[PDB]
Paper text:
To next gain structural insight into Mm GS we utilized cryo-electron microscopy (Cryo-EM). These experiments, performed with apo Mm GS at ~20 μM, revealed that 14% of the sample was captured in a partially oligomerized form with the remaining particles adopting a dodecameric state; particles corresponding to monomers/dimers were not processed due to their small sizes. Despite the relatively low resolution (6.9 Å), the partially oligomerized state of GS was evident in the structure and revealed that each ring contained only four subunits. The four subunits all make interactions with other subunits in the top ring. In addition, these subunits also all make inter-ring contacts with the four subunits of the second ring. Notably, although low resolution does not allow for structural details, the positions of the four rings overlap their positions within the fully oligomerized dodecamer. Strikingly, our cryo-EM structures of the apo Mm GS captured a heretofore unseen GS intermediate containing partially oligomerized hexamer rings. As the GS active sites are formed between GS subunits in the hexamer, this suggested oligomerization as a target for regulation. Using cryo-EM of Mm GS at 1 mg/mL, we captured a partially oligomerized form of Mm GS that retained the double-stacked oligomer contacts but lacked two subunits in each Mm GS ring.
The enzyme, glutamine synthetase (GS; EC 6.3.1.2, L-glutamate: ammonia ligase) plays a central role in cellular nitrogen assimilation by incorporating ammonium into glutamine, which serves as a carbon and nitrogen donor for the biosynthesis of nucleotides, amino acids and lipids. Here we describe a structural dissection of the archaeal Methanosarcina mazei (Mm) GS and its regulation. Like the Gram-positive GS, the Mm GS active sites are formed at the interface between two subunits in the hexamer and are comprised of five regions; the E flap (Mm residues 303–310), the Y loop (residues 369–377), the N loop (residues 235–247), the Y179 loop (residues 152–161) and the D50 ´ loop (residues 56-71), which is the only active site region contributed from the adjacent subunit. Like other GS dodecamers, the Mm GS dodecamer is formed by two interfaces; hexamer and inter-hexamer interfaces.
Author numbering:
A (entry chain O), B (entry chain D): 5 to 62, 70 to 447
C (entry chain L): 215 to 447
């Protein structure tokens, strides 16, 4: 049942004997933050809200619970049931806190609503499944050597995968399909279309649900964009569509490609602005070990209809199912910020009637540098430092995310990159010690 | 004794019973190349030269031995003495090969002679001394925990260091001083002034002589620019001076700073052009791990007289001892190319009367970004890719080094960087496996 | 008191260990026991005052003044063991300077933004190793004495004290907590107020026990000294 009012939540808690409530929210960098609340405190929390420390996000703000986001976690401890809930963050003076990524996404949704559009997102999540050592620490030991869409694994890891699928289904996720991926021990799960806010919340819940199940069954689930060298990385493609008056905006039966002019403007805006928030879509250093030529990851800014290696791909599906897939993001990204920036960039492209240019159907990786220069094919940032430098000078990103989030994100990423750049890796010792 | 003619070399070989002659030359990337020749072949080699493969440098070339470079290596096998010799590389048609770094340095010397100048260089080479494993492979275990100028080591490593010094003196290197360096197990050796060609040849010989002694005494000598994290790296500072008519050009007793206008123009040219051949002065990836703020390595383009943290330092010595020290290069660099580029930059600065600007007498690292922007303090490339990008568009470097060397060096460094950029380091796994 | 051993017993019975050391690991934050306190009279909160700009009564100001005046003396009680002073070092959440603030999060005494009946004062010096009875008794007695004597707490410090210089702190008169257990014991020994509050018997026994503990600790040779000096000397 869909809980709507706090009375419904209280009735469900009493009926199903829920003992603890886990408030859920994410910081600027995408980490999942939470704290526990006893069941008896729930009525007071609904009436007055919960005070807590905002330094976890960014120093005291109040959380106002949202009964519509109540859900029960898919495990049954002997003591009692466990449930999670979400809410909004307010400053002591009563004004909403602008540093919350959820607030950023809500502002983006309101901006879209100003023009009468609504956005639906169905993501494709990819992850690994490694073995645990004798001490239970995560490792990178493979569980099977399967391939793309292979019927693997067939050992107890098969039971682990089935348990993950069943637990996700029990939460009302409505999974479309799940299958093996190209790399060994790599799996993919697809989500049904819904409103972008619910999709982001579902992704955030999904990450830690999968990790908890993996621990409890004796394995490890990893969301690193590139945990192993020489194999495909993990990405989070984002299929998106705009709806006006209950109808798909992108679909246009009168055009040869069955795509409306609005879709062209959306693609043009995305192509124009993708470089400025590539850092947001790929937030960690390891994300750029995946964006290298020779794999499924795109490294060139182009859009295509039949070539499936392009950065932006239009699936052959038409009608109500018309969608646009962006293949740059990875699971380590913050879904709220990424979706908000995608929507804002698309809307800005629509407003300014940006022409997306001619599609690229040939294989870009097989082209020459002079050929790419003649075609004007730009490239994504090579490393996190270049992405930070590109994002710093973008006023569009600053005004979309707000000054506080912009500054904090830039400072954190700069500190992380500065820490990384001074490390001496064993590869250097292997290559240079004997040579020099 | 100073050998001049081939008859002197033959007489010395017969007298001291040298059984093997080893040629000596370096490739574009700075690796030392050599091959052996029996003593009886020496007369025929002097008469006609030796054919060999030019693919080692860059395909049939001819080497014309130079009797003035004959030396005897500082170890005595029971079989007999061993000697080394150098020479010039000629194409089969008789024209000199323009791809030889030694030829590049000779062309630079001739260009300097066109204006009547000659250069003397005394470098300060720093290296580490590690222990070998049970299998005789190089490793990175320290031998002592001494500090700057410390009287360490005092175990058998002391005997190894003394043997190295004695061998260097025995070959006739005329060492000025040798002492411990700041980092543990780090040592420094200083050379006297001499013609730049002889100094470069001496450095090239020095590297493998020290490595061979270290092996034969059971240790390992490393020239890696930064073998350990958190400690000072190894650099090769270059003290240089220009002489005209047998007198030091730089020294001017009339000026308040006792420096001539020619020295100012030289420094100005070096500051102007150092960015374009920073890649040559720092050829490997690890060199840019060494070039980080917080150590003796300089990262900003500036010159000073009293401050010793600047890129270019003017020692307090005056008179014929007047000199200019550049502190960017590291021992992994190719001495021939580095010295040739230094000479070309200095001469170009002298020709155009480039003003070096006001010296920086304060601590640059303590200033803010806005301060350095106001002062116009520019910075060296952060990584090898940036250095390659800067060097690619440099007309001066291309015309100084020639098309062949320029293209080959760029291609090799580009391939190395492309190979490096796609590796997944254990630091990424440590930081990201658990968090993501 | 019940909580401590209940948690320890559960940790054992589930195969883990729960520790209350003020600083078990170097390079990470320590464990502290902040104390939110409020005075109630006639069934209503004394501290809350709707008519003041800061919504705090004069009694709260006097309470803060008394706490600031007397905290240095019973710092030994609030931090009883040697390891407690490995936590009171600059660079972490632990406070090392005597100050009070409303917005600064690093001050020794912090005033949460909550008002009304929820008005409270948080003291951030104590750690879980302290005896709750003695700590709370000393806190109450110091606050009551400050209220009685109309002690002015002075101007709040809204800046980062750690970022300041020693000259600035001397100019502002910002005192610091005792650096080591011996200094805290020396400060406590001459405190007439602490002896009056705790009584002669407890005062003497606590001082003797802490003195013996410090004397035992001060004569040990730690492996850090061997790692640093054996090769050097």
């Amino acid at each position: 049942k869909k809980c709507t009012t706090k009375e419904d939540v209280l009735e469900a808690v009493k009926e199903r004997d829920v003992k603890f409530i886990r408030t859920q929210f994410t910081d600027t960098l995408g980490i999942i933050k939470s704290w526990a609340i006893p069941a008896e405190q729930l009525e007071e929390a609904f009436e007055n809200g919960v005070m807590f420390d905002g330094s976890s996000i960014q120093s005291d703000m109040k959380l106002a619970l949202d009964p519509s986001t109540f859900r029960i976690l898919p495990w049954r401890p002997a003591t009692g049931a466990v449930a999670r809930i979400l809410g909004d963050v307010y400053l002591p003076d009563g004004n909403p806190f602008k540093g919350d990524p959820r607030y950023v996404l809500k502002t983006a949704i309101k901006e879209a609503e100003k023009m009468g559009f609504s956005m639906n997102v169905g993501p494709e999540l990819e992850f690994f499944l490694f073995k645990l050592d004798a001490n239970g620490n995560p490792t990178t030991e493979l569980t099977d050597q399967g391939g793309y869409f292979d019927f693997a694994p067939l050992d107890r890891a098969q039971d682990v995968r089935r348990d993950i699928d069943y637990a996700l289904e029990h939460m009302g996720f409505q999974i479309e399909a799940s299958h093996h991926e190209v790399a060994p021990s790599q799996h993919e799960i697809d989500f049904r279309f819904g409103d972008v806010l619910c999709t982001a919340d579902n992704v955030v819940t999904f990450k830690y649900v999968v990790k908890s199940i993996a621990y409890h069954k004796g394995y490890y689930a990893s969301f690193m964009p590139k945990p192993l060298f020489g194999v495909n990385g993990s990405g989070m493609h984002s299929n998106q569509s705009l709806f006006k008056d209950g109808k798909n905006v992108f679909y246009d039966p009168d055009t040869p490609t069955k795509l409306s002019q609005d879709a062209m403007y959306y693609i043009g805006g995305l192509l124009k602005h993708i470089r400025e928030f590539t850092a947001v879509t790929n937030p960690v250093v390891n994300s750029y070990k995946r964006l290298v030529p020779g794999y499924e990851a795109p490294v060139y800014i182009s859009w295509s209809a039949q070539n499936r290696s392009s950065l932006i791909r239009i699936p052959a599906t038409r009608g109500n199912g018309t969608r646009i897939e962006l293949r740059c993001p990875d699971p380590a990204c913050n879904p709220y910020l990424a979706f908000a920036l995608m929507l804002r960039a698309g809307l800005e492209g629509i407003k300014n009637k940006i022409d997306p240019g001619e599609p690229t159907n040939v294989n870009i990786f097989h082209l020459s540098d002079k050929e790419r220069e003649e075609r004007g094919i730009r490239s994504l940032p090579a490393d996190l430092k270049e992405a930070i430098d590109e994002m710093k000078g973008s006023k569009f990103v600053k005004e979309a995310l707000g000054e506080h989030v912009f500054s904090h994100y830039l400072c954190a990423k700069e500190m992380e990159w500065d820490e990384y750049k001074a490390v001496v890796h064993p590869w250097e010792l292997s290559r240079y010690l004997s040579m020099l």
